[PDB]
Amino acid sequence: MNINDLKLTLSKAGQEHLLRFWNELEEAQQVELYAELQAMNFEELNFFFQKAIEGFRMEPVPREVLGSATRDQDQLQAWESEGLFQISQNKVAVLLLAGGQGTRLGVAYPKGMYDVGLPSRKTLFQIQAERILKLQQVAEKYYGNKCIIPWYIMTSGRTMESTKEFFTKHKYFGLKKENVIFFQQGMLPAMSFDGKIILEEKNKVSMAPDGNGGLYRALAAQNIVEDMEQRGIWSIHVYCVDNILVKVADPRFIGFCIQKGADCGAKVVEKTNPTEPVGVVCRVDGVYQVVEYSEISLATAQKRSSDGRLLFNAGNIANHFFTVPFLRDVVNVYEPQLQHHVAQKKIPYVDTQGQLIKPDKPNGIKMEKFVFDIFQFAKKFVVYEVLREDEFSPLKNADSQNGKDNPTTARHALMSLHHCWVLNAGGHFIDENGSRLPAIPRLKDANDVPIQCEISPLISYAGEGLESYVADKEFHAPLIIDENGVHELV
Amino acid sequence: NDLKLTLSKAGQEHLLRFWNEQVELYAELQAMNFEELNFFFQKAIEGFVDARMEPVPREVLGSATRDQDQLQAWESEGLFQISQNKVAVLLLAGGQGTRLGVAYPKGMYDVGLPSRKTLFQIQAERILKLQQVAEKYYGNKCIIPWYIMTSGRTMESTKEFFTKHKYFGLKKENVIFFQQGMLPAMSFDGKIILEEKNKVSMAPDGNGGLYRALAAQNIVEDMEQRGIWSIHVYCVDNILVKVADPRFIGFCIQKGADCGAKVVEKTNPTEPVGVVCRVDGVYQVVEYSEISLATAQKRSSDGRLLFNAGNIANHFFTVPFLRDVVNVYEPQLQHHVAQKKIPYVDTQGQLIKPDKPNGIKMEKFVFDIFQFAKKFVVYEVLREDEFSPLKNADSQNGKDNPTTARHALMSLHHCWVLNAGGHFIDENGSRLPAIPRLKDANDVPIQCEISPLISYAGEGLESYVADKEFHAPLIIDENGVHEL
Ligand SMILES: CC(=O)N[C@H]1[C@@H](OP(=O)(O)OP(=O)(O)OC[C@H]2O[C@@H](n3ccc(=O)[nH]c3=O)[C@H](O)[C@@H]2O)O[C@H](CO)[C@H](O)[C@@H]1O
Ligand SMILES: CC(=O)N[C@H]1[C@@H](OP(=O)(O)OP(=O)(O)OC[C@H]2O[C@@H](n3ccc(=O)[nH]c3=O)[C@H](O)[C@@H]2O)O[C@H](CO)[C@H](O)[C@@H]1O
């Protein structure tokens, strides 16, 4: 095949404009452009665009399928035991969605590498790794045997390299390299309203990850499910990379799903503010699903039930439970029934004059599948509600943006939680004179700051095991408790 | 050595320790009842509740959400009272700190709204609005006097600001300023700390100092002289505050109460809001800094926190009730204490900023009179509609800062437009969703601001936006519609 056959292929698909700058490119750019174009399926892309353009009631989930960490507190112990047991049997794996690019946070590296400013300065990646290590250890102490929790990590073309290097550089945070499986998701080109693929540069097609629902075709392309089956895994905990509080492989959530005989589960927190950007779990025509925040109407989002809570208050925190057999069915059957969700974006591009432009008005669409669109195909779906202060504080914005879900709110949510762990375990905080500080600080002066406390996951997964370190004792913050002991920072 | 002997019979001699180095230091000194200050300190520190706390009972709790079927009746009653000139508001603006990083009172703060209006102007226009609305609903020019409590630390700036903006359209004679007392800082041993070799460290005596301030300038008499029956007390820092809110006032009136507290649902155990509750039969607010974590995290069977009535510092008091407080109950009010790092001037004329707390500050709280009311009620509203406080600078702890304040207002006005049948569209004219996907560096939420003169709480917008599409930033004011 040569530049002649390619031109024909592109022309028949209505994409010949992709070669318009070909004679102005350096030889090395032509080699690169050529290669990228040869690895694209233009017919499939056209088909996807057609369905997308052509694509231009709800009921709460019944109480019977919703478990609550708060209301069903009497069952936590049983669910936790089940979860730890599954973990000790090596039947549990976690799968991290870390393919998201385009940093709105103002940086060029992936979110997993972000340092939210914790006293320990650990990145989201390391905190996650330590929670996995913690559970491996906890499981080994209540069952005696060493166990493994494989860590599948989905990266995209824009996060793969940097992510792999980062892990290598950190010696996998203490985990074994063989138990961390990286796999890349696919990508899709931005397309203008007329159906033409958009060139970002004269020799480069504007591309982006195909949405977190692209997990399924990625699993197929790299035989991940075969890997899970070979390892003997039964349960998979899928989660979002940006939540500093995520209970990776949370035994309570896993145990709940197992005990209920579910093949699919979704962890949620109560949505109280009508406009919070979280999808809502619900059902339509007896089929379970999530309606993304950007696709719900204000009337629906603000609807209240007789008790005063929002009618649709099951806020998706992107923490799901999938069994391996269900994933196999999704990968080999349902995947094609997943539809692309379309967003109208301002895509930077190169114009006919060869100049890079930042559109004042949206000039194209981005197609993406959502990871929760497979809920509808589950044989047995359940919902598990937890408290957000214990489990959900997302990093989506830079500090200079809208004021929420940023590095500042993330580190403060973690430190406040750990601060609470110490008080609940019997400890206290004091000032410079040994005076006891209240549970909620009076922040009146410029220099006043909240209590800084941080507990390593290796020491405590969710607040347990601290009494011997803090009971009846007082500490000067910042306080850190890790594998090296108790440390009060100066 | 007359006043010099005074300090002696109070162990406060050390104050003149720098006298031999003297005009204002005398004017400030001979205005302090040293006798009383020793009594306050001792009692405040004396002995250096959570178990006896009980939740707010359903009998006294009203909800704007759950009792939506009565908002019309309450709103009418409140508007009626306003038309009868029987309603006044009282702003607590004596507070002043270094927290926001400015040298002026919060009321003058500009959180960055499209209009750039300050909290004072927004509040003033809401007052103007209810007068305008009341005049049209009952045919008669009515008035809502605006009492503003300031401290010696905000008094001058405030008055100037108002005069500058010609009282934002309100009548000078209807805006009554009155100063609140002040209290001295003290060391743990009980000695009044001198800030400067010629200055005593002073600070306002808490928003609870309101009651003594009322007596000092005969504020209550004036209220009776105007025929006012209801007073709405509120905090200055909340950009969404519904000044003279007819619904809250109507609810209290209609319920025949002499004291009321507007609240929002506290969902996060460590949120810094006081919680309304009952202790040994009487209502109180247990301040966020005095509650234990065990109590704060306690949940009820429905999954909500047991003490979920978060005080948003918006109270209802009848003039008769206030009178009884200023002339009888005031003395029973206690002083809440807080350790502080007070800059001082030790021996050898050495001036320094403490690295460790070196004393305490005393304050009375405005809600500590709830316990004296005959009929106390609680009115629960939604925080997205009425509460988004300004307490911290953006560089601080990440909440209740200028950024969240302006976004909470713009999100609410954005919602008013949609609920009135309006629509927002992008540059191509495609309609935007109610909840935007903020994925790129330049993505921002829909910016929208509606002047109170146009809408007080989302009403009267149909003619302005029903079945219409706008390009945000969108501003709707007395000068019409503007797309920036
Ligand atoms: C589709 C989805 O999950 N929506 C949920 C996600 O929305 P958001 O819009 O907040 O997030 P998002 O879809 O952009 O990304 C969520 C997660 O998916 C990852 N990602 C995204 C695109 C991609 O092509 N590849 C990839 O791996 C990303 O790295 C992150 O871990 O989080 C919110 C909580 O904060 C909610 O629970 C929303 O319902
Ligand atoms: C005592 C009190 O009200 N506590 C409430 C107030 O606490 P905060 O500690 O957040 O506020 P704060 O007592 O410092 O000030 C509250 C209001 O009182 C004013 N002020 C304060 C001190 C003074 O000497 N003079 C004066 O006029 C200040 O200008 C503001 O308008 O707000 C929180 C959030 O909204 C809650 O609702 C707290 O329960």
UniProtKB/Swiss-Prot annotation, chain B:
<protein>
    <recommendedName>
        <fullName>UDP-N-acetylhexosamine pyrophosphorylase</fullName>
        <ecNumber>2.7.4.-</ecNumber>
        <ecNumber>2.7.7.83</ecNumber>
        <ecNumber>2.7.7.23</ecNumber>
    </recommendedName>
</protein>
<dbReference type="GO" id="GO:0140374">
    <property type="term" value="P:antiviral innate immune response"/>
</dbReference>
<feature type="binding site">
    <location>
        <position position="365"/>
    </location>
    <ligand>
        <name>UDP-N-acetyl-alpha-D-glucosamine 1</name>
    </ligand>
</feature>
<feature type="binding site">
    <location>
        <position position="311"/>
    </location>
    <ligand>
        <name>UDP-N-acetyl-alpha-D-galactosamine 1</name>
    </ligand>
</feature>
<keyword id="KW-0808">Transferase</keyword>
<keyword id="KW-0391">Immunity</keyword>
<feature type="binding site">
    <location>
        <position position="180"/>
    </location>
    <ligand>
        <name>UDP-N-acetyl-alpha-D-galactosamine 1</name>
    </ligand>
</feature>
<comment type="pathway">
    <text>Nucleotide-sugar biosynthesis; UDP-N-acetyl-alpha-D-glucosamine biosynthesis; UDP-N-acetyl-alpha-D-glucosamine from N-acetyl-alpha-D-glucosamine 1-phosphate: step 1/1.</text>
</comment>
<feature type="binding site">
    <location>
        <position position="311"/>
    </location>
    <ligand>
        <name>UDP-N-acetyl-alpha-D-glucosamine 1</name>
    </ligand>
</feature>
<feature type="binding site">
    <location>
        <position position="207"/>
    </location>
    <ligand>
        <name>UDP-N-acetyl-alpha-D-galactosamine 1</name>
    </ligand>
</feature>
<dbReference type="GO" id="GO:0141090">
    <property type="term" value="F:protein serine pyrophosphorylase activity"/>
</dbReference>
<keyword id="KW-0399">Innate immunity</keyword>
<dbReference type="Pfam" id="PF01704">
    <property type="entry name" value="UDPGP"/>
</dbReference>
<feature type="binding site">
    <location>
        <position position="235"/>
    </location>
    <ligand>
        <name>UDP-N-acetyl-alpha-D-glucosamine 1</name>
    </ligand>
</feature>
<feature type="binding site">
    <location>
        <position position="94"/>
    </location>
    <ligand>
        <name>UDP-N-acetyl-alpha-D-galactosamine 1</name>
    </ligand>
</feature>
<feature type="binding site">
    <location>
        <position position="92"/>
    </location>
    <ligand>
        <name>UDP-N-acetyl-alpha-D-glucosamine 1</name>
    </ligand>
</feature>
<feature type="binding site">
    <location>
        <position position="95"/>
    </location>
    <ligand>
        <name>UDP-N-acetyl-alpha-D-galactosamine 1</name>
    </ligand>
</feature>
<dbReference type="InterPro" id="IPR029044">
    <property type="entry name" value="Nucleotide-diphossugar_trans"/>
</dbReference>
<feature type="binding site">
    <location>
        <position position="206"/>
    </location>
    <ligand>
        <name>UDP-N-acetyl-alpha-D-glucosamine 1</name>
    </ligand>
</feature>
<feature type="binding site">
    <location>
        <position position="274"/>
    </location>
    <ligand>
        <name>UDP-N-acetyl-alpha-D-galactosamine 1</name>
    </ligand>
</feature>
<feature type="binding site">
    <location>
        <position position="287"/>
    </location>
    <ligand>
        <name>UDP-N-acetyl-alpha-D-glucosamine 1</name>
    </ligand>
</feature>
<feature type="binding site">
    <location>
        <position position="391"/>
    </location>
    <ligand>
        <name>UDP-N-acetyl-alpha-D-glucosamine 1</name>
    </ligand>
</feature>
<feature type="binding site">
    <location>
        <position position="206"/>
    </location>
    <ligand>
        <name>UDP-N-acetyl-alpha-D-galactosamine 1</name>
    </ligand>
</feature>
<feature type="binding site">
    <location>
        <position position="439"/>
    </location>
    <ligand>
        <name>UDP-N-acetyl-alpha-D-glucosamine 2</name>
    </ligand>
</feature>
<feature type="binding site">
    <location>
        <position position="180"/>
    </location>
    <ligand>
        <name>UDP-N-acetyl-alpha-D-glucosamine 1</name>
    </ligand>
</feature>
<dbReference type="GO" id="GO:0005829">
    <property type="term" value="C:cytosol"/>
</dbReference>
<feature type="binding site">
    <location>
        <position position="236"/>
    </location>
    <ligand>
        <name>UDP-N-acetyl-alpha-D-galactosamine 1</name>
    </ligand>
</feature>
<dbReference type="InterPro" id="IPR039741">
    <property type="entry name" value="UDP-sugar_pyrophosphorylase"/>
</dbReference>
<dbReference type="GO" id="GO:0005886">
    <property type="term" value="C:plasma membrane"/>
</dbReference>
<dbReference type="GO" id="GO:0005654">
    <property type="term" value="C:nucleoplasm"/>
</dbReference>
<feature type="binding site">
    <location>
        <position position="92"/>
    </location>
    <ligand>
        <name>UDP-N-acetyl-alpha-D-galactosamine 1</name>
    </ligand>
</feature>
<feature type="binding site">
    <location>
        <position position="287"/>
    </location>
    <ligand>
        <name>UDP-N-acetyl-alpha-D-galactosamine 1</name>
    </ligand>
</feature>
<comment type="function">
    <text>Catalyzes the last step in biosynthesis of uridine diphosphate-N-acetylglucosamine (UDP-GlcNAc) by converting UTP and glucosamine 1-phosphate (GlcNAc-1-P) to the sugar nucleotide. Also converts UTP and galactosamine 1-phosphate (GalNAc-1-P) into uridine diphosphate-N-acetylgalactosamine (UDP-GalNAc).</text>
</comment>
<feature type="binding site">
    <location>
        <position position="94"/>
    </location>
    <ligand>
        <name>UDP-N-acetyl-alpha-D-glucosamine 1</name>
    </ligand>
</feature>
<feature type="binding site">
    <location>
        <position position="288"/>
    </location>
    <ligand>
        <name>UDP-N-acetyl-alpha-D-galactosamine 1</name>
    </ligand>
</feature>
<dbReference type="GO" id="GO:0032481">
    <property type="term" value="P:positive regulation of type I interferon production"/>
</dbReference>
<feature type="binding site">
    <location>
        <position position="235"/>
    </location>
    <ligand>
        <name>UDP-N-acetyl-alpha-D-galactosamine 1</name>
    </ligand>
</feature>
<dbReference type="InterPro" id="IPR002618">
    <property type="entry name" value="UDPGP_fam"/>
</dbReference>
<feature type="binding site">
    <location>
        <position position="391"/>
    </location>
    <ligand>
        <name>UDP-N-acetyl-alpha-D-galactosamine 1</name>
    </ligand>
</feature>
<dbReference type="GO" id="GO:0003977">
    <property type="term" value="F:UDP-N-acetylglucosamine diphosphorylase activity"/>
</dbReference>
<feature type="binding site">
    <location>
        <position position="207"/>
    </location>
    <ligand>
        <name>UDP-N-acetyl-alpha-D-glucosamine 1</name>
    </ligand>
</feature>
<dbReference type="GO" id="GO:0006048">
    <property type="term" value="P:UDP-N-acetylglucosamine biosynthetic process"/>
</dbReference>
